[PDB]
């Protein structure tokens, strides 16, 4: 279990992943700020925007990513943004006593329950897998380097960067959870659950209590507003 090049590849993913943190001035707003729908929405907005900064930073350092066509690199970034961002938020909800105040801000932010409800099911669903940091990081690379996104010119080039990340992730599922032989398969299933938010997202973008807000620049650009 563990291959020299696979360790090298993992160490490289982790160097990059651990750099990615939610800034404390943002989390302080969760505790400090006035409680209403507008101010709550503004908070989530800042956090979403930060999701993108971090994931652009991660995407950039991914092994092989600079060797891809400049168009294709953008197609993968915009392609994976929604999936990637929800995943990161789930990591930052499951892994203090602030989850509670954040949840309450989320549920009193003018977003209707048809979106909020499966956000939280997903968080529970992924939280039951008890994933290590290393599993999260590889999953995130696996999502980001999906060959199945809209507009990719050279899909096979993307495939050949994704495949080794799946091989490593599978070994990590044996290493971290040997008790649970169906654990890797179970992570692939949560990716199925994760892809459903591409439709939940496209709808919200449309919705009146989501379209009549002016999203930060990075947001308008990544989400094709």
């Amino acid at each position: 279990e563990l291959t020299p090049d696979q360790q090298t590849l993992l160490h490289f993913i982790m160097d990059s992943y651990n750099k990615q943190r939610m800034p404390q001035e943002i989390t302080n707003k969760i505790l400090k700020e006035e409680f209403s729908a507008e101010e709550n929405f503004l908070i989530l907005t800042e956090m979403a925007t930060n999701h993108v900064q971090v994931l652009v930073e991660f995407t950039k350092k991914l092994p092989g990513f600079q060797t891809l066509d400049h168009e294709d690199q953008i197609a993968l970034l915009k392609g994976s943004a929604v999936e990637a961002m929800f995943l990161r938020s789930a990591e930052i909800f499951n892994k203090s006593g602030h989850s509670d105040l954040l949840e309450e801000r989320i549920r009193n932010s003018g977003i209707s329950d048809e979106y909020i409800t499966p956000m939280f099911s997903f968080y529970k669903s992924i939280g039951e897998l008890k994933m290590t940091q290393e599993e999260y990081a590889l999953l995130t690379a696996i999502v980001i380097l999906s060959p199945d996104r809209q507009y990719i010119k050279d899909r096979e080039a993307v495939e050949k960067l994704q495949e080794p990340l799946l091989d490593v992730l599978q070994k990590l599922c044996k290493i971290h959870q040997p008790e649970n032989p169906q654990h890797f398969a179970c992570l692939l299933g949560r990716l199925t659950e994760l892809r459903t938010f591409n439709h939940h997202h496209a709808e919200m973008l449309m919705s009146w209590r989501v379209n009549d807000h002016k999203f930060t620049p990075l947001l308008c650009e990544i989400w094709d507003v």
Binding site: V56, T59, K60, Q73, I74, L77, L218, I222
Partner: peptide
């Protein structure tokens, strides 16, 4: 197109 995302990728 995508000047912002291009800037952020090349830094």
């Amino acid at each position: 197109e995508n000047a912002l995302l291009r800037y952020l990728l090349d830094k």
